[PDB]
Write a protein that binds this ligand. Structure first.
Ligand SMILES: [Mg+2]
Ligand SMILES: [Mg+2]
Ligand SMILES: [Mg+2]
Ligand SMILES: [Mg+2]
Ligand SMILES: [Mg+2]
Ligand SMILES: [Mg+2]
Lengths: 185, 262, 131, 58, 441, 70
RNA sequence: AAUGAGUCCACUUUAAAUCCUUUAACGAGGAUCCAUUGGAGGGCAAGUCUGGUGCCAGCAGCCGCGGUAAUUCCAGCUCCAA
RNA sequence: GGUGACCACGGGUGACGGGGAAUCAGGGUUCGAUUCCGGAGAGGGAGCCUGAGAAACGGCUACCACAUCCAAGGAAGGCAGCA
RNA sequence: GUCUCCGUAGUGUAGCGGUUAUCACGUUCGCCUAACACGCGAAAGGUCCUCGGUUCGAAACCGGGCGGAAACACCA
């Protein structure tokens, strides 16, 4: 029949029990400090950390020197140090369990442009990313959840077409200028 | 069904064909020929996804119908002709020759050979019987049969068939200590030397193979192609010499190659 | 026009279809996707040929502008290009005409012609009445 | 039937219709989350009350 | 290309209303000789052989066995100059609502009164239905019409002058009273059961030397019905005006679904846009359109077509509903409307709260007079007095009413065919008028 | 009385004035009343509640978001 | 100051269209270009606010609320969860 | 003689089987009409020609159930294919 | 579309061309109780489905239309 794929998976897990003060306040603190839109995308990063920790624990259950354990452990550690959430000298499966969601939230492009001073606040950072003002290497990114690697950490910069790098001021600037010259010849 | 199937779904195609999932719903469905469809390489995918000489089935059809594709010294216009194991693909207009040999991962690789080496071809005999008038007969691993062979040649040995004549020029006996190649199962595409053959009457004989690195394995007797007299192969081996290396020493080779290229 | 460059990659020549094929990308910094004809003559200059044998298609523009990439096709001669090439790219260049009835009407005629046996005048007169 | 269905919609019927008070729009999405984080996390109050709830009817 | 004109045949019960038009449809080539002989044999058993031509229009078995027309029926043929369709009428006191449906969806009309003694006199009287037919003709917008007298073979002597002359003078003075011009309308003698004077001048009667019709478009002379009907005025087409389409009936045809049928008033309907039905307020894409089992690309005004719509059932949309394009102004349910009316006859006085039945286009809805605004002169629309308290016959007035049942109307100043309406009670047309202002719900 | 299998049931009408939106011979849609064929609350032997009437939801009529199909 | 959601030219895509990605020109100050669905006694986060009703209407998965001062119904305001 | 308390035989299935899916400490519990593989069927049965391959139904024959046309003498049917 | 029947307070119906009323009731109010339960007496409740016609006058005599309950056909 059809040549589709229909391979898809959910990226978040809802909490087992709702309406609990501690989890609600922690999640709201994370959202407010990191400028997230809703609770779904803090549950998403929690799910990502949970899957990584499950893989780490499963590998730790395997016997040492097992080639499958070694191969998957080095692959997982390499990915963890590429995304920058783990220290380069911390190449052990035990340290993977000690990582936190705050480590993953810090590597987001939205937090990164705020840390680099390109934005005045985290919400300014998000709205600045969404409007195609931020570029990585050469590609422009409008996705706040863009996880930035260590090699791509240095290459975050304003978009050339944006009215903060190259020229071409926005529509309101041009409208104000033409109104000013029309009122004042 | 009420008869033979003449379709082949894309996902049910053999894995070593390396077909994807999004281009279509169907697979080439190779025609009947010298080789089973499970371990054959129809010329459409060979000329479209290995060589990229064509972009679609229609372009490879135009390529074939201009009479440039030569298999075993004969021009084959069948777009879905089952090429199969170690049949020489000759393209005279661009002047290169291909020997179809499994790689280290058990897939047909793009192996280029010289024209003087392309003139001959190894064949594994499958059965030897005597026909009418007491005339001996010999059947290869292909569908090719030849009369009047050497009486020394026995079952599942290897013979040297030269093209444009179809005759036997030399043979290699299936003996312990001869270089072989596995043509089925998990050990597909692995080059090694015959070390032991334990035979089970009423079942499948099992033969043991050790490669140059010293890694020993075993496989069924039906999945072995003797390729060399002792240790020197009679064919040009592909990249890696058919030595299956594990992922641990594959990853660091990739890293070293990237560091050299970077 | 001031800042447009053609860079080729994955270039290869084949004699099976008597052509040289490649995939190319054009860098338009602040302009729209470059029209295919412009690629045609700029590549013809790039390979010292005429802007009639040049065949391009499949131009997808990357997100945020800048680079757009398509697959290039150049033949040795026009007769070969008419011989081995899909008819729709010929029609895009005007070298092939598609003046023909609908598939529905063609099926209607084919099914109506099945009702008349043998008789040439009536089997060709089958579609004259039900227009 | 015992005949008691004639009182259907009674209290809703007698409830005096009072119009909703027109009001400023509420921020939605990320801005709402920011505002409610600001209200209940970044603030210092010098007045007692044993941490009275956000809907205190004082 | 070739124009289309709707024709409606009105007359009396058993006046040959269907027999002579069966003759006509057979002579012009609507049916064959074999079918008419089949009708003859089927009428031979139960003795109603005189209506064998009438059963062509009388599609119902009940219509055949009862010998009368219960509801309208449709037929088609090609004339020597253009294309037309024909609608019969029930021609009975009980089925006035059915025939005003057909006459409302008309372009022209023909009226039939039997020339025999005892029927023409009963035909045109107070209880006589010819007055009702001719009145509703002008009420519902029959701008031009012809008249043909039937069954002068039973007259004494058959095919005679003075009988024809007295009946044409009677109907001529009646139509001069009603507003129609005797000069414009043709006067044709036709012998139905014998089948005379439809294609050729029947020489059994030589005293008739043809009629002359003089009109604003031009002049014409005639000796036969075909010569009369080929020179009718091609009615105007309000094509630019947005789509309006009342629904004569709804069918559930096997394999395609619901097919509402109605005569297109304004606009062009073609398969490929959504339509809206006003009394029920349902929105639905039109799928296909078809006149007389012939598929068409468009529905021009004045076309009595059946159009197929999608994903709906037969009970969603019913008779009397009006369709219109949602892309243009959509028709929608009306709370009430202001109407200027002409009171015709009523034994008592008319008061507020009087609830007769209003018959507009296809719809037949009883409307209750909310209150009376003012009385109006017969002519020129002149003011008489404000706030009336009663009404009598021979009067005009401005009155506001609300339909008891959901109904959609259009003011005459906007949609003329839907502006015309009639009022029926006690088996006469009590009031006639047009619509001026309509509120929208 | 259900359209299929002709069974007669009793269904609660769950709001303040939604009995007046119900007339005879209507086509109602009835769902379960909460706990899988078991009576709920102070209502003896009622296991169903009306969701829609005449192919329009009782919620829409109660909120007044749309009108009866007159 | 900055952007889209939309209008909308061209290119591109495509068998031909369409969509997406490019890209002209318009396009935001109640930026009215308007976020909803369910709740606020407990479970279970959220009101001992105000007006109606008075074991009536109704709510309530369960405990239970209502018999004239309802933290639970019908409404306004205000909060709560996604 | 053969099969049976190691459940024969019979009945029921809201049973096409599997690869798989949902839930997820571990162990398990439900669901797989559904795109891949195997099977069955073409309204219900039944019987055949041709062909290498059919008990074929976008082949035929017969009965049964529905159902089309008719000039009433006959003729023609199978959307659990795409719409 | 046609035909058949029915339609009075909220249900159950008396009803006369010259009076629509009662009844189990239903409701309300007094009637005792903190709340009841039982129990005593009055009131309201009708365009006679609606609109008209006949008549000096009709709910009822008739013509429609509406709602419901039956059946009949209705295939661009
Ligand atoms: Mg509340
Ligand atoms: Mg089953
Ligand atoms: Mg299955
Ligand atoms: Mg299958
Ligand atoms: Mg079968
Ligand atoms: Mg069969």
């Amino acid at each position: 029949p059809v040549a589709r794929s229909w391979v898809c998976r959910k990226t978040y897990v809802t909490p087992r029990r709702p309406f609990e003060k501690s989890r609600l306040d922690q999640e709201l603190k994370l959202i407010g400090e990191y400028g997230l839109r809703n609770k779904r995308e803090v549950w998403r990063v929690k799910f990502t950390l949970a899957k990584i920790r499950k893989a780490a624990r499963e590998l730790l259950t395997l016997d040492e020197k097992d080639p499958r354990r070694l191969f998957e452990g080095n692959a997982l550690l390499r990915r963890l140090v590429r995304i920058g959430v783990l220290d380069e000298g911390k190449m052990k499966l035990d340290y993977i369990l000690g990582l936190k969601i705050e480590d993953f939230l810090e590597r987001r492009l939205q937090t990164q442009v705020f840390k680099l001073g390109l934005a005045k606040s985290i919400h300014h950072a998000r709205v600045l990313i969404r409007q195609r003002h931020i570029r990585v290497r050469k590609q422009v990114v409008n996705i706040p959840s863009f996880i930035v690697r260590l090699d791509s950490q240095k290459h975050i910069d304003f978009s050339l077409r944006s009215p903060y790098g190259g020229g071409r001021p926005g529509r309101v600037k041009r409208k104000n200028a033409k109104k000013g010259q029309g009122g004042a010849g | 069904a009420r008869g033979p199937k003449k379709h082949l779904k894309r996902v049910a195609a053999p894995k070593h064909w390396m077909l994807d999932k999004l281009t279509g719903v169907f697979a080439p469905r190779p025609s009947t020929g010298p080789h089973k469809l499970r371990e054959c390489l129809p010329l459409i995918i060979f000329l479209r996804n290995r060589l990229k000489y064509a972009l679609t089935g229609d372009e490879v059809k135009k390529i074939c119908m201009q009479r440039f594709i030569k298999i075993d010294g004969k021009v084959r216009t069948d777009i879905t002709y089952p090429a199969g194991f170690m049949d020489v693909i000759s393209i005279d207009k661009t002047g290169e020759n291909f020997r179809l040999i499994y790689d280290t991962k058990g897939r047909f690789a793009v192996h280029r050979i010289t024209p003087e080496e392309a003139k001959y071809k190894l064949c594994k005999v499958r059965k030897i019987f005597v026909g009418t008038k007491g005339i001996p007969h010999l059947v290869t691993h292909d569908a090719r049969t030849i009369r009047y062979p050497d009486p020394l040649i026995k079952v599942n040995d290897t013979i040297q068939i030269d093209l444009e004549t179809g005759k036997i020029t030399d043979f290699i006996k299936f003996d312990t200590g001869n270089l072989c190649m596995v043509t089925g199962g998990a050990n597909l595409g692995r080059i090694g030397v015959i070390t032991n053959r334990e035979r089970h009457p009423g079942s499948f004989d099992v033969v043991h193979v050790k490669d140059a690195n010293g890694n020993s394995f075993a496989t069924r007797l039906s999945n072995i192609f003797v390729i060399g007299k002792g240790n020197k192969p009679w064919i040009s081996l592909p990249r890696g010499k058919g030595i299956r290396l594990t992922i641990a020493e594959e990853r660091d080779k990739r890293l070293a190659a990237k560091q050299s290229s970077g | 026009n001031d800042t447009v460059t053609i860079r080729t990659r994955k270039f290869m020549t084949n004699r099976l279809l008597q052509r040289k094929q490649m995939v190319i990308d054009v860098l338009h910094p602040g302009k729209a996707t470059v029209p295919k004809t412009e690629i045609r003559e700029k590549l013809a200059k790039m390979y010292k040929t005429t802007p009639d044998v040049i065949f391009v298609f499949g131009f997808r523009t990357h997100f945020g502008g800048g680079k757009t990439t398509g697959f290039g096709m150049i033949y040795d001669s026009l007769d070969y290009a008419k011989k081995n090439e899909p008819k729709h790219r010929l029609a895009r260049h005007g070298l092939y005409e598609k003046k023909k009835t609908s598939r529905k009407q063609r099926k209607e005629r084919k099914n109506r012609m099945k009702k008349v046996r043998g008789t040439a005048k009536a089997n060709v007169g089958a579609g004259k009445k039900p227009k | 039937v015992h005949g008691s269905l004639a009182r259907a919609g009674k209290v809703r019927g007698q409830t005096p219709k009072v119009a909703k008070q027109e009001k400023k729009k509420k921020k939605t999405g990320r801005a709402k989350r920011r505002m409610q984080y600001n209200r209940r996390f970044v603030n210092v109050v010098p007045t007692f009350g044993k941490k009275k709830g956000p809907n205190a009817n004082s | 290309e070739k124009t289309h004109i709707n024709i409606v045949v009105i007359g009396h019960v058993d006046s040959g209303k269907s027999t002579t038009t069966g003759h006509l449809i057979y002579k012009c080539g609507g049916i064959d000789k074999r079918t008419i002989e089949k009708f003859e044999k089927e009428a031979a058993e139960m003795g109603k052989g005189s209506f064998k031509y009438a059963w062509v229009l009388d599609k119902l078995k009940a219509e055949r066995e009862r010998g009368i027309t219960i509801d309208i029926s449709l037929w088609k043929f090609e004339t020597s100059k253009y294309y037309v369709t024909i609608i019969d009428a029930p021609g009975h006191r009980d089925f006035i609502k059915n025939m005003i449906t057909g006459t409302s969806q008309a372009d022209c009309a023909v009226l039939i009164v039997a020339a025999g003694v005892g029927e023409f006199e009963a035909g045109i009287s107070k209880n006589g239905q010819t007055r009702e037919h001719a009145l509703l003709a002008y009420t519902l917008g029959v701008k031009q019409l012809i008249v043909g007298v039937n069954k002068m073979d039973s007259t004494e002597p058959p095919y005679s002058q003075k009988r024809y002359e007295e009946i044409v003078k009677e109907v001529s003075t009646y139509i001069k009273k009603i507003g129609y011009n005797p000069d414009t309308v043709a006067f044709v003698p036709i012998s139905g059961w014998n089948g005379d004077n439809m294609l050729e001048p029947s020489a059994n009667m030589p005293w008739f030397k043809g009629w002359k019709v003089t009109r604003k478009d031009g002049n014409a002379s005639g000796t036969t019905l075909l010569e009369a009907l080929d020179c009718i005025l091609p009615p105007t087409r309000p094509t630019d005006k947005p789509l309006r389409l009342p629904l004569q009936d709804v069918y559930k045809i096997g394999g395609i679904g619901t097919v509402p049928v109605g005569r297109v008033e304004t606009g062009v309907l073609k398969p490929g846009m959504v339509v809206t039905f006003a009394p029920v307020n349902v929105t639905t894409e039109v799928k296909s359109v078809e006149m007389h089992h012939e598929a068409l690309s468009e529905a021009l005004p004045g076309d009595n077509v059946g159009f197929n719509v999608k994903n709906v059932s037969v009970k969603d949309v019913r008779r009397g509903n009006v369709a219109g394009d949602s892309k243009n102004d959509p028709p929608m349910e009306a709370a009430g409307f202001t109407a200027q009316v002409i009171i015709l006859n009523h034994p008592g006085q008319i008061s507020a709260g009087y609830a007769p039945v209003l018959d507009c286009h296809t719809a037949h809805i009883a409307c209750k007079f909310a209150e009376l605004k003012e009385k109006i002169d017969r002519r020129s629309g002149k003011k008489l007095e404000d706030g009336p308290k009663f009404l009598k016959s021979g009067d005009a007035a401005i009155v506001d009413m609300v339909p008891g049942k959901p109904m959609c109307v259009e003011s005459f100043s906007d949609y003329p065919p839907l502006g015309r309406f009639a009022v029926r009670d006690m088996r006469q047309t009590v009031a006639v008028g047009v619509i001026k202002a309509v509120d929208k719900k | 009385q259900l359209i299929k299998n002709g069974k007669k049931i009793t269904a609660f009408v769950p709001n303040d004035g939604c009995l007046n939106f119900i007339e005879e011979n209507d086509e109602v849609l009835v769902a379960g009343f909460g706990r899988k064929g078991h009576a709920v609350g102070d209502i003896p032997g009622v296991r169903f509640k009306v969701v829609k009437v005449a192919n329009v939801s009782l919620l829409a009529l109660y909120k007044g978001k749309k009108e009866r199909p007159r």
